[PDB]
Amino acid sequence: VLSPADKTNVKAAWGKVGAHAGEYGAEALERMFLSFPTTKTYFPHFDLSHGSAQVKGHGKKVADALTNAVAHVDDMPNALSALSDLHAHKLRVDPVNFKLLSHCLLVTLAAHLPAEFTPAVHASLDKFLASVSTVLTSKY
Amino acid sequence: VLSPADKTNVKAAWGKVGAHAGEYGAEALERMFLSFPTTKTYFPHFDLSHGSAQVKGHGKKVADALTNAVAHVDDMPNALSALSDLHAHKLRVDPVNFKLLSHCLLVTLAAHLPAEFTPAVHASLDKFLASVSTVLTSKY
Amino acid sequence: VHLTPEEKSAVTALWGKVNVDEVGGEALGRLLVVYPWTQRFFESFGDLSTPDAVMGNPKVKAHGKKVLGAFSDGLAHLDNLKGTFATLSELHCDKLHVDPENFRLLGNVLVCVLAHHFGKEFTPPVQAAYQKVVAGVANALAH
Amino acid sequence: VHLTPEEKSAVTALWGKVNVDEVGGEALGRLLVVYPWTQRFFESFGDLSTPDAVMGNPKVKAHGKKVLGAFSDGLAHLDNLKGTFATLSELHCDKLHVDPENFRLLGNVLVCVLAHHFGKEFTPPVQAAYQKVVAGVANALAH
Ligand code: HEM
Ligand code: HEM
Ligand code: HEM
Ligand code: HEM
């Protein structure tokens, strides 16, 4: 459950992220693939090398999903219903992988926005990514 | 996030639990203390022996809270607010301990209701206890 | 796993009354039902949509018999769990890519199944010794 | 922890540019802020209500210097992590009752702090090497 203060923090942080979302998501996916090779088994049809166009496109898709989740923070379960059905019913992704991807997104945000990544902003982003991860792993 | 089906399953299961809630909660607390001794550090003022009146009373309170959560499944954050502030702000309990207590409650329910503990009922109770644990581990 | 003589005697006595052919499959099916993401590893077992189809699966039953036989082999070598579960650890880590938390989940499901099948006989101390046994098994597998 | 020569060279070079006196305390403060249940352990330190009070605590800064010094001692003995962190593991398991997941959380917070301080030169390979290093440290502490 999120408060108003951290919701405002995530909204401001992602608004300041802005148009770099696609490259940030691609870099986060690359970091997840490089540091957690077990997650590579979920993408056997992808080319998982550095600078891959498929990874860049999937990162752009993930970034757009994060942007619309930020826009719909108060009503996540039904705003991300298609993704929840994709990840839980079809893909059957372990929530550990969601935790790893959230950690890699946090690392990317820290490495790209030092002034933006305050300790309060870090906590707000952490629990926002936990809320997106729980919605996408929920099966209902 | 819970579906209507597992919500109905938990409602029926706890309605059939009924008046044995206090004994079941006391036994669950005893099981948690015996199998996970690290949780005993959260109760330094209690007498944690077998058949203890303090443990029986605390189990009765926990069972009453669980019954209230069952009666208020759709609005847990607003129904368990006092307990959320108690466990998250004052007590500051690790969610691992909540997971252990949920597992011990599941073991107690399995040992006391064979006919009631169907595999679907088990899944519904697991998700219900995860939802109560998440509400009591969140900060507002 | 370090256990008292009383705990070891209690664990072995409960294990003798264990109906492996049923309880192993029951534990595997309950894992698949309560934690549906585990069906990714068992998609080759056929129909796993409904709990009744999961519990009526001969492949699930046979795999549960094999998982329980490993649990019995580990119980017979409680002082050598790491060496007993080395080939299985390699198979689960390098070949199957199973997350170690799933081992703890399966151990908890097995404990719940034992409680369901034994009732009052599965007392809080017996549950504690069994929890130590399944934690040791999970740690040996995750190595 | 097994590392390639390139990974070890990258890890050691970044560690030399690390400001211990700052980043150890900042990592501890970020752990306390993002995971507030960890303040149960740090109650002696004093005011830990607001993030600005957590990050401006001399006791938190000193304890973060000690935690980073242990991380440096572990980095200097990457092939003997289990034997290096034996006393710390005993202290954290028997005297402090700290859950092992908190070690992984602190390692992730430290990695985030390193990323925040090193920006672009914290490449994904460096992050992977540091992730497996902190994972080995957490495993040595949890033993
Ligand atoms: C944590 C936040 C996540 C978000 C916001 C997210 C979002 C998305 C989006 C937008 C798609 C595109 C679906 C489509 O184009 O049809 C997708 C697909 C997919 N996701 Fe995620 N995802 C997340 C986590 C994960 C994780 C951690 C994994 C695996 C470790 C994963 C595995 C997949 C896979 C395998 C696909 C299929 C892509 C394809 O077939 O091209 N997801 N996700
Ligand atoms: C579903 C899970 C839980 C429920 C429904 C629950 C419910 C309750 C209730 C009703 C009380 C009584 C508060 C009062 O009388 O003022 C309480 C107190 C308390 N709870 Fe929990 N609790 C849960 C989990 C836990 C766990 C896992 C722990 C520790 C490992 C814990 C630690 C405590 C402590 C230390 C108290 C104070 C009791 C006292 O001071 O007498 N709670 N909880
Ligand atoms: C204490 C926990 C576990 C034990 C003792 C155990 C034991 C075993 C055993 C005895 C086998 C048979 C290997 C063979 O016949 O060569 C096996 C295979 C396998 N295990 Fe496990 N296992 C455990 C946990 C898990 C979990 C939790 C999963 C998945 C979520 C899993 C996935 C698999 C799969 C997919 C196979 C191969 C099945 C097949 O090829 O038909 N294991 N395991
Ligand atoms: C994960 C890597 C960790 C490292 C390298 C580490 C390192 C250390 C060291 C070197 C000490 C000795 C301090 C002294 O002798 O004065 C210490 C003490 C302590 N540790 Fe850790 N620690 C870690 C994780 C944690 C975590 C995650 C927590 C709590 C959530 C924790 C709680 C404590 C506490 C409470 C003390 C005693 C502080 C005091 O008495 O003032 N440790 N740690």
Author numbering:
A (entry chain A), B (entry chain C): 1 to 140
C (entry chain D), D (entry chain B): 1 to 143
Sentences from the paper on this structure:
As monitored by UV-Vis spectroscopy, metHb has a Soret maximum at 405 nm, indicating that the heme iron is in an oxidized state (Fe3+) and incapable of binding O2. To eliminate these possibilities, we next assessed the effect of the protective oil layer on grid preparation and downstream cryoEM imaging and data processing using our metHb sample. Briefly, we created two metHb samples – one without and one with the protective oil layer – by placing 15 µL of metHb (~ 125 µM) each into two sample cups. One sample was used without modification (non-oiled), and ~ 70 µL of aerobic Al’s oil was carefully layered over the second sample up to the brim of the sample cup (oiled). Two cryoEM grids of each sample were prepared using the chameleon following recommended guidelines. Both metHb samples were imaged using the same microscope parameters with approximately the same number of micrographs for each dataset collected. We did not observe any noticeable differences neither in the quality of the sample stripes on the grids nor in their behavior during data collection. Both datasets were processed independently but with similar steps and parameters to allow for a direct comparison of the resulting densities. A comparison of our 2.78-Å resolution non-oiled and 2.71-Å resolution oiled metHb EM densities did not indicate any notable differences in their overall quality. Indeed, the view distribution and the total number of particles were similar between the samples, each resolved to a similar resolution and demonstrated similar map-to-model validation metrics. D, E Comparison of metHb densities determined with or without the protective Al’s oil layer detailing no obvious differences in the metHb densities between the sample with oil present or not.
